[PDB]
């Protein structure tokens, strides 16, 4: 309403590191990724439950989400709807988990030792979506999976899609191969920019008048994160189908 | 940096594989079983007629 | 000097233009589809909502970086 | 610091808004899904 | 040498460019739809006004950023 | 010095660019729709007035910004 | 120096293309409106000149301000 | 100092464009209306020439201001 | 210095996008009309070449000032 | 020196204007085609998302270039 | 200095956008006309070539200066 | 090495000893007179080529003008005919016809301005002759509220012939500059038929100038 | 100097703006065609890809030039 | 004076801007035509490739300027 105080300052960074580096180099993103994976495993275990065809019980929600994802993948294509379904479901609810937890209380201030000194108060949250390494790894894995699927389905097709697309005169290849190669880097950069931008907004915009300014911003950020997770999940299947097609 | 990226990739791959084996396989199996049970029940109604 | 202020002005204005024009075509297509087959009212609501959500996603990217230049 | 308090306040407001915005529609959808599953079970029982 | 002056001018102009070209197409589509059929009526009016308010928000950003430099 | 002069020029030009094509699309859509059918003339005229008001709002915002920079 | 001439160039150039094409959109819309139905030509006549007047009112804001720059 | 030359180039640079897109769009509507209704003639043509004149007036203003600052 | 050279570049380069799109739109409308109605092939051609005469005139307004500022 | 800030501002502004109207007409055409037939709406909804993604990728390239310039 | 190369770059960039979108609109109109009816294709292709030649003339206008500045 | 130069001269001032534009005009006139002599004396009832030029140029232009404006095409037939069979011929002679401004020990601004002056005199004489006060119509009349720019429209018409002269000088001069550039780098036109494109552009420009004159006459009619 | 950073910004931005709206138009027209008649999606989608690739070629040309200037 | 880098950046970006949306509009028209007249591929896709060849050819000339900066 008024926001008399609370606007202490604003500070952002590319990423945040975590402890445990002596035994094995660990960044705060790894801590966030582990937490998201643990939450996903716990949800699956609770979703599984007795698994005796129990309706509702908070497992029907996960079942409906999985069914909707399966229907979307089937509509996209059917050649690898079964084999690749776990691959897309891996991104689903994991990119979603990364988008989540950004609006948690002190998500950007978690693990700060403390504005007095800030000597080694590295924020140990570093949202896994808000890390270039995680997005780069996910995109590389997706591109490798798409290339392997194309080679297995039509090994000649993958090569002929570019080299033999139009042998006479010019060909769709090279440009097509370059576009596909940029597609992995493009997907990586998409996750890099997303989530990171939301966090930067939640910091900077809320730094001034943190009252009903961060609220719609966080709502839009959550919707954007869910949309981005769904977009990446569908785009992996779309690239795979284009390679098959 | 690159080592951290490789470690994150390995962790994500392990989590995804565990999930595909346990939840995705079983959840999909359960949904398919329910749908197929309904369909075979329609077939059994046809057999009833 | 104020060259950074000029940078903030350029960022905010040239990041507001894109979404500003885009959402117009978005909701124009939406109301057109209302006038022709309004049976899809729920679908058009959802799809125009996500389309705008992308537009002010771009807009808020522009605004937050503009603040960063101003920071 | 105070940034944590501001983030907590914003998160509380967002949760309060969301719990009334569409939680009831979400509950309705969940109940509908459960009803569809139960209807499938009942249809199976009837057919058998 | 007066960089803030050009900064404010650029901010205002490049913030105000968008909403006009938006609102044009916006209300053109809705008015064509209502001319086709007046049934939607208020329903389309409501669909239009919020869409216009979305670009009004970007106009507000364009004005406010210049105001900060202006004072 | 001259920076304020070019600042005012940029402000007025970039505040006139948008509303121009704005009102253009406004009137084109309105005349097309009223050409589709009469008996909604009053309603299309009201929406026309809303559109011209919203475009000229940003127009006068740019104009008064330039006017204030004039002093 | 010639920065006043730069201001005049920006004033005359920017803010003219907008209304310049807006006029074309207006008249084209009116033209197909009357072509589809010539019985509404009187109403088209009333709407044309007022739309043209408003876009030209933006253009003349662009022009007279440049004359003021010239002094 | 060639800054006046740069100003003149920029002035005429955007000066001879308003009609460019305008005659592009205006003729489109004219010929489309003629194809839709070849019976109507000379009224569309009078409006055509009026629109052409109003569009090219801005280009003439740009060119004449460019000449005035160049001599 | 080379500021007169970049001024020549501004003069010739600018005033090209608009006439280019106009050259596009004129024949787009003309061919749409002629396919829609081949019996008007003469009149559509005449109303195409008038638009040519205006848009190329704008392009040459750019070009002639490019040569004048060049020498 | 502050010109890096200008570079980042320009980069993000360009990357925001670029895909704005892009995604706008994307979702406009999507809702259009959905209104024409809600039967094949799923297939077209699947097909439009890669188009959204390419534009978003271009925007992200524009944004990450600015971030790279920052660091 | 390098300002001459900047002049050439600006000249070719502004002279390539215009015909670049021009020819696109040319062929766009031609192909909608063809898809409407592939019976007037001879006349359509002739007028398309005329438009292509005009766009090429614009391109040459914007392109010869690139080498002239080198001279 | 680029060596292009501007041939701007003063029509009012006496002709220069070189007179490149005057020489080109004389050559074009000589070629046209040679063609007319070849088509006139050796003329048959159904000539091929000799009468083909007449039938496909003069008759075609007369038919087009009649379609655009019947009963006014007859009145200003001489003006459109003079615009035709010229300018295009001068450009064809100037399209590197064995000289290319080389081996010397329309593009002229003055000529284009004089042609536009002739066009505007055609306006002042014929246009609004059927009305007399037509030039004052829709210009600050009782309905001047909706016709305030009507005088501005007349000024644009006054600027329309000037723009026509500019378009005659422009493009035609451009073709010369492009040919010079191709000679300086990548000679023999270019990978594309530069020479053919320039010739077609000049022909299209001449036809567009004739059509613009006819359309300006029609606009002055109403 | 910061000229390299503004150079990369200009490169990526001015090379990305085009293909953004390009992809917009591509998939827009594709979605209207498919909704109109999706029986020929096999080819329509293939055309979209070839066209998407053609515009992405320019996009990656801009991006790789920006990268080269960055290193 | 490292103006060569910004020169090539502007050249590539602002030469690639036009052909992007040119490819977009030509393939929009072609996908519409195929959604109307599929078997006409042998002629319509030939016209497609011709119009394509002009566009990226112009962009490639821009790229040759970019390499002339290397020269």
UniProtKB/Swiss-Prot annotation, chain B:
It comes from the Bacteria. It is found in: Cell membrane. The chain crosses the membrane at residues 1-18. Belongs to the ATPase B chain family. F(1)F(0) ATP synthase produces ATP from ADP in the presence of a proton or sodium gradient. F-type ATPases consist of two structural domains, F(1) containing the extramembraneous catalytic core and F(0) containing the membrane proton channel, linked together by a central stalk and a peripheral stalk. During catalysis, ATP synthesis in the catalytic domain of F(1) is coupled via a rotary mechanism of the central stalk subunits to proton translocation. F-type ATPases have 2 components, F(1) - the catalytic core - and F(0) - the membrane proton channel. F(1) has five subunits: alpha(3), beta(3), gamma(1), delta(1), epsilon(1). F(0) has four main subunits: a(1), b(2) and c(10-14). The alpha and beta chains form an alternating ring which encloses part of the gamma chain. F(1) is attached to F(0) by a central stalk formed by the gamma and epsilon chains, while a peripheral stalk is formed by the delta and b chains. This is ATP synthase subunit b. The chain holds residues 7 to 55 of 164 of the full protein.
Curated annotation (Swiss-Prot), chains C, E, F, G, H, I, J, K, M, N:
Keywords: ATP synthesis, Cell membrane, CF(0), Hydrogen ion transport, Ion transport, Lipid-binding, Membrane, Transmembrane, Transmembrane helix, Transport. InterPro entries: ATP_synth_csu_bac/chlpt, ATP_synth_F0_csu, ATP_synth_F0_csu_DDCD_BS, ATP_synth_F0_csu_sf, ATPase_proteolipid_c-like_dom, F/V-ATP_Csub_sf. It comes from Chloroflexus aurantiacus (strain ATCC 29366 / DSM 635 / J-10-fl). GO terms for cellular component: plasma membrane; proton-transporting ATP synthase complex; proton-transporting two-sector ATPase complex, proton-transporting domain. This is ATP synthase subunit c. It is a multi-pass membrane protein. Belongs to the ATPase C chain family. The keyword Ion transport applies. It is found in: Cell membrane. It holds the Pfam family ATP-synt_C.
